[PDB]
Subunit: 438 residues, 4 copies
Amino acid sequence: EARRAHEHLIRLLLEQGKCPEDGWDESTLELFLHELAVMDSNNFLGNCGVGEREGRVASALVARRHYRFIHGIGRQPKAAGSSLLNKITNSLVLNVIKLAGVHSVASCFVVPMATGMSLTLCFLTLRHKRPKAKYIIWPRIDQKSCFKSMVTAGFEPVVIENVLEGDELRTDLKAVEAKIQELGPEHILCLHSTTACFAPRVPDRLEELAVICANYDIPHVVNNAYGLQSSKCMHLIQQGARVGRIDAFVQSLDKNFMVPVGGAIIAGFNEPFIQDISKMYPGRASASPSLDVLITLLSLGCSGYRKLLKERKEMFVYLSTQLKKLAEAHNERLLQTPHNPISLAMTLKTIDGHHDKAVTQLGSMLFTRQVSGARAVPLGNVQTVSGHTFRGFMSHADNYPCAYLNAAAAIGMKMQDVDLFIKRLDKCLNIVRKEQTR
Amino acid sequence: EARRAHEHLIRLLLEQGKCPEDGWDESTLELFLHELAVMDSNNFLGNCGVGEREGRVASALVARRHYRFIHGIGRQPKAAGSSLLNKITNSLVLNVIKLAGVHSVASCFVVPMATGMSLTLCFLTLRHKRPKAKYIIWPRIDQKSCFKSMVTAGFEPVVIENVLEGDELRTDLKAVEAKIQELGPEHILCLHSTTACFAPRVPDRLEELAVICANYDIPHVVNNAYGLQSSKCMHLIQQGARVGRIDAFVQSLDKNFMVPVGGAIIAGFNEPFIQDISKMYPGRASASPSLDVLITLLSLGCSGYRKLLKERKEMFVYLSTQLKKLAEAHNERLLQTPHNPISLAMTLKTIDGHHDKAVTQLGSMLFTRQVSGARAVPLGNVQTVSGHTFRGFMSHADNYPCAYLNAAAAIGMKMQDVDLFIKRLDKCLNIVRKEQTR
Amino acid sequence: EARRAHEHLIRLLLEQGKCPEDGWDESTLELFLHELAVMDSNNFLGNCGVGEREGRVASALVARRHYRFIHGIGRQPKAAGSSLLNKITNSLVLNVIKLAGVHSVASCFVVPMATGMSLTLCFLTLRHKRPKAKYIIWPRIDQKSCFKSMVTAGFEPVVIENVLEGDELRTDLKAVEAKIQELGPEHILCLHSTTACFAPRVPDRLEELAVICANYDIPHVVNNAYGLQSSKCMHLIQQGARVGRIDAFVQSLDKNFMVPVGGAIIAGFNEPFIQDISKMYPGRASASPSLDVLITLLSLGCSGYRKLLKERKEMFVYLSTQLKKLAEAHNERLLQTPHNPISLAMTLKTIDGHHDKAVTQLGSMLFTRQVSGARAVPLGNVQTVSGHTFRGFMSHADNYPCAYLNAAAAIGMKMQDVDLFIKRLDKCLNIVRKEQTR
Amino acid sequence: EARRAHEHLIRLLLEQGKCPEDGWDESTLELFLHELAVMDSNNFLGNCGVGEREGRVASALVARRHYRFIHGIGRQPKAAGSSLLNKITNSLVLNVIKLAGVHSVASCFVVPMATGMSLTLCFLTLRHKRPKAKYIIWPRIDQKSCFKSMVTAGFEPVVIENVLEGDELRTDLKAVEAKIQELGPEHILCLHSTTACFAPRVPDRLEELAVICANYDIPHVVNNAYGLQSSKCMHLIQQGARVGRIDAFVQSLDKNFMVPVGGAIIAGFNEPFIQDISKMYPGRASASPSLDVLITLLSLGCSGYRKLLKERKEMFVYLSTQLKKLAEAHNERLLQTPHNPISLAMTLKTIDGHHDKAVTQLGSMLFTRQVSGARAVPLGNVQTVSGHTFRGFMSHADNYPCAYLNAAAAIGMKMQDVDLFIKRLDKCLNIVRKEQTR
Ligand SMILES: [Cl-]
Ligand SMILES: [Cl-]
Ligand SMILES: [Cl-]
Ligand SMILES: [Cl-]
């Protein structure tokens, strides 16, 4: 019987909480969602509501687009279907974290805030654990949201400059320890490290930082914003947890799962602590990020997600081979950034140094040609963000040797993304050089 | 011409940013949304994306249900359509705040966090303005999210007990000032007052608190979670701003606009300050709450929203008349709470005092009968929430004179909500009394 | 339990096949549709298809918009869900025919052809019953589809001119009988009469025609295209069946049920005959009309449909009162057409007779002003349709005394339809008269 | 600019009426559909409607699922958007007919009836051209809809038995001519031939029939129900038109385009004649089939459709290779039917002849195992359909030599359709043989 086959799939999901190997048909998915929504009190046929939060909906377009899930999520029930939705979604995500390369993950939850505010929530929770602490030690990465996250939480970021090793910018482990000793471990809220990042920065030395955190008894929060899509980044987290201390790692829903911006996952190795972060959240929250990742994971299944991850690696190879060929044809080179598995950079030395803002102009030319996501990084940008002045802003160092153009192979990239980029970049560079050579 | 008529409506919205008097047809609305989405780079036909946040979507169900808005909202652009969506939505909401009764509002923004976290954001911003402050003075209201909001922000709530005046619980203005003097104004982050609330508590004495805040130079943040739907609550805020100091007022999207849980509006009278709160938010955020309230307001228009507000007042009268008749028929009474325009309470003295947990049982019986939102409040509940032990928890006082049942006429209530509630309550009370009388 | 309440509604529908008194919520409706679609083989999870009609769908937009019903309808099964959909829909429609005023209806079915082709199907079936017959006797009504229906079926229409009685055009019963006698009853395929029609024609004298058909042993097919919405029209059919012979009556889905054009209902009093018409249909047919009327009737319920019918009568009174006031203010009059319960006409004598095509111009002016559905009927139109030349075409007579403007109160009409029409008509008439009076 | 790129695609479609080489994004498609719907009067913001067919819609679910196209299609305008929809759709389909292999097609139109009723419409039109004719000469194919089509139209089918040539059943050209001479050409309405059909019948000898029709001056209507997906079938039609007479060819929308059952395309080589068939249709008709094929073709583009056609050929090879291997492993054989490009048959001699209804049982076993579309054809079925008794019904001959199982590779078939079929068939045959061998 037709209906029993759908029931079987739904039952296997409910009982184990695991991502199905193969993706569900849309029919099964919508049957499931409609069944869950029926469980929420706002949807009961016999319901009468006499409170201030009844999940009433004025617009049919709004009700429908959300599959009639109106009550949001929490951490007798007013929304039994939404609670089941939350629980299942968190189970699927824990599973996917394991699939992605952190097999020893203990606990996780979706929070419908993006990664910056999600990091803030971790810091807000740590405040109560460490009431003496005022500082967050942070290996520099020129991205405003993660920097702000510390200031928003009410802490003083201690910016640790990176080391130039060949073309790569890497964790200055000695500088990290020197600041710990200077300021006093009891005065440090946590170390706040970062995995996936713009080349030529690479993921932080998490093994070594984890040892430092263990030894000094300082919490360690990892900004894994877009590292979940990378088995290399995820292995770093796993290894870090094996050899030292990692208290939480945070990742974007949109960047790793191809869903709208708005949600993140907070995960860790100590269940009581991760639950403490969740409990620190005041009030109900949007169910929309959770619904998006639930639909996506059930539709892809383990196989579909694994396929995307494999395809990302394949596209990274393709982008790298194509960008290196282009670069060399224009007497540039691909920066040597073997430790960055997602992001890469070619030099822009041939257009830089003419005192004409050509590097910045190139970024603009790419944008006008409907290339999104490229970063043309010039030398000497100065920018002040929330009390800190960054010299060499965009380059994660005060004195990076050259200007460069940064592109990345993130999950969902297609051959046409690479091919169009290369075609357009070639044209733009030819235009700039023509203009510069009279 | 057909198309020009739609264009006219869209143009009038874009140019002025005001809520249309009469609601748009769905056709016009969807034309508009499709046009905005086209403006976002992820939707360009000629786009190639080479970054880590390209707004790629794996599931067609996810893409469609969000009208192809994937990039989220912020405070060259990657998402021009989403930015316009954000700007328009905030304009419409400012307009509606004026319509609702705070005509002098200067600035506001939708934040896709619910009201508890939105209050936290206000507190997080005030930390930087007042680095010496550790305390938040807070007239007691037994609701976990707003209490937590203070603790989550990293501040110590100073719980001010309420005064019993007749049947009402009201602001203890003398106790508020005594704590200000005891602790020192410079040590107070803000006063955190509350408008709409469970009867028999009533909205705080905002005029008087505003004078206190002005005189002591202490910020004043108003928890207006579900007060926007009440012209009486909104007038209180307006008057408060006229006679003293109010720095921010926060309201729920779901409770005042009949949309899913997940978003709130932060509003105030000083544009630089409100903008400072917005700037304190790290990173991009979900566009989903904004889209929901945009669809809702364009669909209702000013007239449709005004109608809902009028209907709410009419339903409050109906609920009050019906509940008083029921109460008196069971030898109970309607508590005299004229200062609460949304929430009301009947006594439960006839079932209380038998040492059998009958009051709590009644709440359970109502819930099992698909009555949502009623609160059966017994005497003597003790609960500890985030470091504070509340005696008489649920009753907003240690020693409220009697047990009671609390129901409310919130926006969107229907006659059947009242009628079914009354029918079911009558039956439940008859059952309990039968059991108690052997 | 929430789910059981939905099940109860679905079970009551499946067991009895009756229209629910009150309309279902959308949630219940979509649960039901999803459950039915699951029953169709194209939707089985374990299905493999090795035939030429597997219900495969290339576009997700197409699959979704049809609720995954792909197999169409017929009169072991490949589409058990679609067959149930067909059966239920026909049951609901039979019920509604009774509600609408033909209580003695025996059998009916939805056919996804519009009313003209549906009449053709009746004629095609009668051919086999009456192989000697070549003629269809037809009281004139100037509407191309019903006229064509006879020619398309391969029969010769015998056009019976109407009688002028006061302002009304009515059935010429003597002319009908004279043609029967002249041509011979055995040579007449059927009499083809019409109920709802453009004023000042009125519904045919069905009682008297039914007696004629009974006495001469000639089938009687009633064109009830838009009469189902009228209890007066429906009573005429009922009475006709009581006092004489009516073999089939046909009505539009779109005109009586506010759904897209495309379907009709064939109904009658002799089940074997109505089933013979259904059996005459070759092959599978679209399920889309049936799905539309099923969704509509379940959503309205008996109460919602009854309400629309009552509202139509109320709007007819309003349109008549408003149009008479307008007419008289312009020195015109409302034609006296008490026997037409839907359609009415005001005279246009004041603009006619200037040899300037003013009547036709008025129709054009109304159309340019976004008035749809009005008919400005001039004198002296000659048009040939499928072998017959109609003099006075549009007026259902060769020599109707005056030009007129025809408007109607059909199901779903709103006060604004009347008010805008009246406002626009007033302006147009003033313009024409100004132009004509130099 | 983003919007201009969509406009470009829409403009190129409107100006030329051709299928885009590459498929449109959904965004472009929905923009286009919303724009067309805006053009229909029921959707005008300023519209007032005072007629009986205003396209009013009671249910939002119905309005939305049809993209607000309510007025249907025809052959001043009430539905300018629907008329454009009809015109464009017919243009795209003409284009696709050329792509599919009838390059010389002159005219075509979508009719929202399935293929049986569409053939009826052709016959109904021919009646008026040939008022003396009563007979339709028809090479036998055991399919009820196409047989009925002739009877429904009011004509007497003259069933021409097929010739056994090897394993194939083919057109008996001599028998066709003998009947023409016996009955008289002037008494023949048309020859009604068939292309795609169940093996071991093969497509009719259209070249030879076309010569016969030309020479005798008898119209020729081709039942191309599921031949459009086959370049071999389409070439036969093209060649037939080149060497003789073909007046119309009819094909299913669902079987060739992977859309819901309900529509067909009537096409031919003489524009006035094809237009005469269209003009014979009385009244408005559903727009739903046209919308489905429009969405499908714009979404696939020429490339996507070409790909499906290529994939069908590839799947036919796979099905044939797999079914032959299975058959031979069970001591059966694949019937030699090289002239049938879609349908194939393996023998069932090993289970036949035990007087136990095993062949029919096998069909039932396959059906119970969720194999759809297989046909287990036994010897000796007698069935009477609309006045004709077919001996050997299902086998297209009175005395086909053996029982067989018929499977087909139609458009949209997947490898899993073949693989599951083969796995299930193997099991079923093993079960039957076990039962038969005690
Ligand atoms: Cl990797
Ligand atoms: Cl109020
Ligand atoms: Cl009536
Ligand atoms: Cl082929």
